[PDB]
Design a protein around this ligand. Structure first.
Ligand SMILES: *[C@@H]1O[C@H](CO)[C@@H](O)[C@H](O)[C@H]1NC(C)=O
Ligand SMILES: *[C@@H]1O[C@H](CO)[C@@H](O)[C@H](O)[C@H]1NC(C)=O
Ligand SMILES: *[C@@H]1O[C@H](CO)[C@@H](O)[C@H](O)[C@H]1NC(C)=O
Ligand SMILES: *[C@@H]1O[C@H](CO)[C@@H](O)[C@H](O)[C@H]1NC(C)=O
Ligand SMILES: *[C@@H]1O[C@H](CO)[C@@H](O)[C@H](O)[C@H]1NC(C)=O
Ligand SMILES: *[C@@H]1O[C@H](CO)[C@@H](O)[C@H](O)[C@H]1NC(C)=O
Ligand SMILES: *[C@@H]1O[C@H](CO)[C@@H](O)[C@H](O)[C@H]1NC(C)=O
Ligand SMILES: *[C@@H]1O[C@H](CO)[C@@H](O)[C@H](O)[C@H]1NC(C)=O
Lengths: 191, 191, 191, 191, 191, 191, 191, 191
């Protein structure tokens, strides 16, 4: 509900592809497969491929890609403005992927789905079953991001590990935001 | 509720047939027949025939199809602009079917209805009835997309297979979106 | 709730009689009599007579029917434009009945009320009472479209047959829409 | 709730007395007396006298009734336009009563209150008390339109007869609408 | 809730004192004292004195009462227009009391509070206590319009008599409306 | 909820201090102390001192009180207009106190808090404890306006006396309104 | 909810710092520490320091404090207007603190938190524990303003003392308002 | 809910980065890890790094940082206005971090997460386990800010310590606000 709330707040306060990516995330049914084999793949895919598609889309929506390919295709184009126009296009296009990554990291769903089956959750596993094959722990830990599937509360506290992984995800998200802001500052200060 | 939410978000942010197809999907009562004989037919039909109707409709709503058929009908028309006008009409018309397919794939209802009776769900079938005729499994698996009909929780976990098939559907949807975006990029870069 | 939702969406997106028929359907209390003698009559009547009334109404609301009857009544009218004006009036009037039929077919209430008592529901009738007089089955099947009246769950699963008949109705509705769109395409391409 | 919904839809789509009558019906507390002596009187009265009052009101709100009575009162008026003006006034006034009758017939409350005590409900009366004095059946059937008063479910199924009478009322309403539309068509085509 | 609904509908459709009286009734906490001595007084008072106050208020809000009293006070006023102005003022002022009376009669609260203790409710009194002093019946019948006070369901059915008295009140209200409309028609047709 | 409803209705229909006093009452947390010593004081205070403060405030908000005190302070002011200006100021200021008193009387909270401990409630006191010291009745009757404190239902029916006192309060309120309207009529008719 | 209601009413009716202070109070999470040592400190602090901060803020937001300090700093400023400008600034700034104090006194939360542990609540303490060390009563009375902490209903009725202290707070608030209004009247009448 | 309420109130009343930080806090899912090792780190991080990022962002969004770095980079710039422009930029940028810190201190979530495991809560620890190793108390106290994890109500009252720490946080927040306002007053009065 917080994501939809901030969506409405951004709409009220309101370059546009940022809101598009935010809305698409807030209205995308993230469903972790909750299986030890496809958890990592699904999480990393949701993290990686939507920003790639947003990058391509931002390139396509640009009204002057045709002139770029026309000049790049000719031997002697009717040239410097070309590099500048291409850099401007790339910079305008890179906004939506960054917004998507930041949003999906602050909301640690992809991180929880991806890193649950293999993470080291030893402070959460009950003291009784503290000696059992990690292959048995694989399925149980993989079922963690699923509320309606995880029916083994006697072995692992679900919320206790959920909060831990979500905090790690939020830390990674803030680190990403800081690095991106530093790079943007350097770019705006040099070029 | 997510589909209606994104519908309202698209309305707020707001060529028009895209919103028409999105609204028609969000307000269409998808009812899987939940029978081993008509599941596949119904799913594939909901996937296939609505985009065909949208294609035809987009052709009909075009204001200058009459001039196209008039020129194609004459031996010597009062011609090149004809191919260009036809290509432009087709490109404008192809938008709504793609939006419909993308929406109905991201929301894996048609996929779940179509591929449930014949898919290989062996990790979900209970260990007790792990040796029984696939003809008996046919009806049970066909009843999966129906919440109020599937009353055999002792044989197959419904949600566990629902998430699996829905994840496969979302993967197919993202693949479709990527391919369509690549084709659109090539088209806008060449012609 | 889906019908009212699409009504509001159409109002937001917004020749006018289409919305009138949609609203009138979404606000009409369809009550199947749930009797073996009047089910068919009521269903077919709700399917047939409202579009006839809409046709007549669309003819009446037309501002230039008076000139049409004046010219048709005279021996030598002060004539060709007459056939064209009449065809245009008929084409404008035929919109609301088609919208009504499409809506009431996509929402398989009339179909369920009409075809329930005589349809062949043998895969749904319980295995115990699989040998009983069809005259006894008549009343039970007729009571199917009534949630608060059908109190014989031990003989027929209500939802299982409801979904089946509703799917058949939706198939018929899509077929009707496709045929109508093809005819409209031919008309706009020829005349 | 359907009546209020269509009221709001009519307000959104929006000679005016039609909406006035619709609103007055949707906000009028219809209370059937549920007594064998006053049921018929109350139902027929709600059906008959409100349209008469609407007719009189529409005559009163007309701004040029004074000139009509002035000319009708004089021996030689300062005359043909008189008949035309009177006919136009009557036609404008006759709209609200028709709307009231149509609405109160489509919503079979008046019909249910009026015809319940004397109708022949023999397929609904339980098989046990299938032989008892019609004088005893009078009170029971009269109590049918009252949900909070009818406490004799062991003798007559309330909903089963309610649906039957309401279907009859809706049939009568559609017949009335068709006849009125035919008359309006003839009037607009002749005069 | 119906009164507030029609209040909002009147506000949307929207000489002004009519809406004022309607709003004041819909927001006035009618509390029947439910005592055999003050029931009649309270009901008749709520019926009678608010329209008197509305009449006086409508006279006061009139901007030209000062000139009326100035001319009526002088021996030879600087006269015919006086009678006309006074009649116009009275006619404009008489609107709000009529609206108040009509509203409070259609909503049979005042009638129920006033006429419950002395009315003849013999078909509703239980057959067991069908022979008891009317002085004992006085308190019980007086407690009828109070839902949270009437705790003698074994002697009189509350809803059965409530509907009866409310129907009588609605009949009286419709009679009042018809008489008022006839008088208004005669006035507008003569003067 | 009725007070807030009429507040919103007044806002929609919309000299201004009247709405200010109405809003302040509808948003003021009236808390009767429910003690035999402070009940009367609190009720009469809520009835009396807020209108005094409103009177003073209306005098202060007046933009030309400075000229009034300047002229009243001088021996020979640069005089008749003074009496008229002062009377106009007083008449404009007297509106809000009257509105406050009328509102707080129609909503018999202050009356109930003030007159409960000493009123004669003998028809409501149970027949068992019909002979006990009035000093014991003092606390019980004082606790009447408190729903969550009055825990002696076996001695006095709370709602039965609440309705009685509230009806008396509403009678007093209507009397006050009538007297005020008569005085206003006389003032507007003389001066 | 009453505070937010009056906030919305003030916003609808709508020098500005008054609404700012009202909003800040209605959206400030008042949490009494419910300890015998910090109750008084917290209550008096919430009563005292926010108006001081509002005073300072109103001084800072003033656009011409710089000229004031510039002239006060110079030996011979390029002087009388200085005293007038300073008085006007102070008078404009003193509004928000008064509004804050009035609001937080009418809503007797600070008073209840501050004066509960040491007040004399002897009519509320149960008759059984009417003889016990005031040191034991200290903690119990301090826990009074906390609904979820006060678990000693057998010793003191919580609501009975809450209403008493809240009534005292409202009396103090009305006294403050009257004194402030009198001072404002004198100021506007003299200077 | 109070934070969102004040967000909406600020939006209605409505340099812009203040609302941005407020919205971002009200829509940020604060999740305390509830572990004795990461509690302090997470709390202090949420308190410290978001204002740093807001500072950097406010520097980046400034349209004339490029001219600043251009002049600072040159040996002899085409200089005094430089220091003034830089000071103005820094002052404009310092607003959002202060708003973030004030908001997150008034809402004592970060303080509660950070200082719970090591604070001295001896008046809240039950009298039975008043003698146990502080290492055992570490985990229990760390679990305090988690409602769904703290399942040791027999050792420490959760709400009693929550209110205490939240009150300390609010005191610190008000102190911070006072110091910031004093510094702003001095700055606006000197420079
Ligand atoms: C740990 O397991 C034991 C039994 O093996 C059970 O009683 C206990 O509740 C479990 N505790 C947790 C925290 O899982
Ligand atoms: C599997 O079947 C057994 C009995 O055949 C039943 O007790 C158990 O609950 C079932 N488990 C699942 C996951 O279906
Ligand atoms: C079929 O009938 C038997 C008894 O005749 C009953 O126990 C069973 O539940 C019924 N099943 C269905 C699906 O109607
Ligand atoms: C009919 O009456 C019998 C007893 O007389 C009762 O058991 C049965 O439920 C009733 N059925 C209906 C449909 O009223
Ligand atoms: C009538 O009274 C009898 C006992 O006197 C009671 O059993 C019955 O329920 C009552 N019926 C009504 C309708 O009050
Ligand atoms: C009156 O008191 C008796 C016992 O003293 C009790 O049983 C009865 O319910 C009470 N009635 C009322 C109306 O208080
Ligand atoms: C007073 O205390 C007694 C026992 O000490 C208890 O039974 C009673 O309910 C208490 N009453 C109040 C009002 O606290
Ligand atoms: C303190 O502990 C005892 C048992 O050790 C328990 O009965 C009591 O409820 C506890 N009280 C609190 C306030 O934790």
């Amino acid at each position: 509900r917080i994501m939809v709330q901030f969506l409405q707040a951004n709409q009220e306060s309101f370059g546009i592809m940022a809101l598009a990516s935010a809305q698409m995330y807030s209205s995308f049914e993230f469903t972790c497969p909750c299986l030890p084999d496809y958890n990592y793949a699904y999480g990393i895919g949701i993290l990686i491929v939507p920003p790639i598609w947003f990058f391509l889309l931002g390139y396509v929506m640009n009204n002057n890609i045709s002139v770029l390919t026309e000049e790049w295709k000719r031997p002697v184009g009717k040239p410097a403005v070309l590099r500048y126009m291409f850099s401007s296009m790339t910079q305008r296009a890179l906004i939506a992927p960054a917004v998507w990554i930041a949003v999906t990291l602050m909301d640690g769903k992809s991180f929880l789905c991806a890193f649950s089956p293999t993470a080291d959750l030893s402070e959460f596993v009950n003291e009784s079953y503290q000696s059992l094959s990690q292959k048995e722990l694989l399925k149980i830990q993989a079922k963690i991001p699923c509320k309606d599937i995880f029916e083994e509360h006697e072995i692992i506290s679900r919320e206790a590990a959920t909060r831990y992984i979500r905090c790690l995800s939020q830390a990674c998200g803030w680190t990403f935001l800081m690095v991106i802001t530093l790079v943007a500052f350097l770019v705006r200060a040099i070029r």
